[PDB]
Design a protein around this ligand. Structure first.
Ligand SMILES: Cc1cc2nc3c(=O)[nH]c(=O)nc-3n(C[C@H](O)[C@H](O)[C@H](O)COP(=O)(O)O)c2cc1C
Ligand SMILES: Cc1cc2nc3c(=O)[nH]c(=O)nc-3n(C[C@H](O)[C@H](O)[C@H](O)COP(=O)(O)O)c2cc1C
Ligand SMILES: O=C(O)c1[nH]c(=O)[nH]c(=O)c1I
Ligand SMILES: O=C(O)c1[nH]c(=O)[nH]c(=O)c1I
Lengths: 313, 313
């Protein structure tokens, strides 16, 4: 009995990793994730120049999940590149690097410099097409024409295997369109579903007040609120992109949620809000929980049930 | 202290009502919601001809909410018109009628006949632009050009005050465009935010199966999953539509959840999943809870806190 996977020319002790943004902005965070039992890690989505992000409070967690409008704080692309180049221990686990520039030109500039490090070190790119929290910057992947441009330019400039972080959709025609756009780009080897559910609004009853400061309280939701949305996008893209990998993200607190993700078609499973709240010790729990589920069901590997959700009639 | 209010030339005893689709398909259903202590009711969304809807199972509920792909089963516009014209007791509470024709022409044909009944009886139209559940018929209001077309045509054909049932949005530009489309139409007096969050997917871990039969298990989500999404939509349209009423729907289980909808901007508060699970007794509980919250806070009217959610700085 076995959680191991071999994908994108990398070996992974298990399918669990952090979700981009959680426990991965600093060298400290990145060392902690590397020392965890996770099968991999992804760095904070980054821009060319360092960013402070939005004013605090900008994240808040609740029994049923979280809301955030961080505003893309990060240490700058130079820092995450150098981390991949010179600091990361690839003998421990694979590293993904998330880039989330604010224009196609910014992203082009970044991937041109990442390319030789990817070739040398085998760092994998996750291209963020779904930040919902910087104003006047509505999410790329909700504009299919813009999405096409980003993927053309980045394929051209990068010329290596990468993946894309997608926002959730809520409409069959949008699964259709979005999956066909992706399938135009053979360098897109994986699709991460999903980023937070955009622009929800949490309100505290006692104080009569929104709980995060930026954007009049509006920010992205994660956690228990979004699991069924996440499972839908995962499976929508799994069925729609049979020559790609789907990484699942959204609402994972247990081996069971991870089990459902994987049934829906997920290869890697990312953990955001639950990791933010419980800390990196979550990865040992999730492993043991998933393994107990597999044992009880007689599954010996992940590939035995990946993508095998049953439909009725 | 009493929560009575006046809107759309009608008096209401309290701001509560059922969500369209819940406890309102048959005469029996409608008499039951009429005899409840709700302040109003809305009828099941209808088409010109009777429909059986999708195959069962097509609704499932869970501690955190519901998923459905009912598929618009209804008794036919002729039945709900007759209920409106001859059977409803207007002395009890006002009545909203929901129409969900599958093309502009079908809607135009329905509202042409509703018009005289609305003149005579004051029944109120709720135009449904957001069924996420009929195959091949994606949500109207996620296509702004289609939405404009429906609102032009129904406005011309009906020539009387009506409201709209909107699907949730998740991006500021969409809020901007959607509210500006609405604002093009003076006859749109109210906006109901929100319909179910479209095309979620619920999976049963033990059985490894989706839980509803239509659309490979994909359906609309209601309940605790969507409260923050609903609040965001209510507030977004409340700020962007200063000259319309906003009706809140999504994730109401208690007087607190109603207080927050009203704080976000809600004039009426609709109840779907929680009413489906608890039954019409819920209406008396919700009233007592909301009145208890008002008293502890020193509020005497709804109008004192409606839309007065506070932001930080
Ligand atoms: C504080 C915080 C920061 C995040 N930062 C990023 C980011 O930098 N890049 C990104 O693609 N997604 C980011 N996300 C979204 C998560 O990666 C994930 O897509 C989302 O939280 C849903 O998963 P969850 O339900 O486990 O939280 C962030 C989420 C949170 C709460
Ligand atoms: C079984 C069921 C049937 C529904 N039918 C309709 C309908 O005919 N028309 C409509 O506009 N909304 C319909 N809805 C959506 C609800 O009116 C409501 O917008 C949504 O469920 C969210 O509120 P909730 O969180 O209280 O469920 C239905 C929802 C459910 C669960
Ligand atoms: O504001 C963030 O830092 C952030 N927050 C999110 O929820 N998703 C994202 O992609 C990002 I870049
Ligand atoms: O399938 C339904 O009947 C239904 N279900 C929903 O969740 N929203 C709707 O508007 C409708 I018309």
């Amino acid at each position: 009995m076995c959680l191991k996977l071999n994908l994108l020319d990398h070996v992974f002790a298990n399918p669990f990793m952090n979700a981009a943004g959680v426990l991965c902005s600093t060298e400290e965070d990145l060392r902690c994730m590397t020392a965890s039992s996770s099968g991999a890690l992804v760095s904070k989505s980054c821009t060319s120049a360092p960013r402070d992000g939005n004013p605090e409070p900008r994240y808040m967690a609740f029994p049923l999940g979280s809301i955030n409008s961080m505003g893309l704080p990060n240490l700058g692309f130079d820092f995450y590149l150098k981390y991949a180049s010179d600091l990361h221990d690839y003998s421990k686990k694979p590293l993904f690097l998330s880039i989330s520039g604010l224009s196609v030109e910014e992203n082009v500039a970044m991937v041109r410099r990442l390319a030789p490090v990817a070739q040398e070190k085998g760092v994998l790119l996750e291209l963020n097409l779904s930040c919902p929290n910087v104003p006047g910057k509505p999410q790329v992947a909700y504009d299919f024409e813009a999405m096409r441009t980003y993927l053309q330019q980045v394929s051209l400039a990068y010329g290596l295997p990468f993946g894309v972080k997608m926002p959730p959709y809520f409409d069959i025609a949008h699964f259709d369109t979005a999956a066909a756009v992706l399938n135009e780009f053979p360098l897109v080897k994986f699709v991460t579903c999903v980023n937070s559910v955009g622009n929800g609004l949490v309100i505290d009853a006692e104080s009569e007040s929104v709980v995060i400061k930026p954007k009049q309280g509006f920010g992205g939701l994660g956690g228990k609120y979004i699991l069924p949305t996440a499972l839908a996008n995962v499976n929508a893209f799994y069925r729609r992109c049979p020559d790609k990998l789907v990484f699942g993200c959204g609402g994972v607190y247990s081996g069971e949620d991870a089990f459902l993700h994987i049934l829906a078609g997920a290869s890697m499973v990312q953990v955001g809000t639950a990791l933010q709240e419980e800390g990196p010790g979550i990865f040992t729990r999730l492993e043991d929980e998933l393994l107990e589920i597999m044992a009880r069901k007689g599954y010996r590997t992940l590939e035995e049930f990946r993508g095998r959700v049953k439909t009725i009639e």
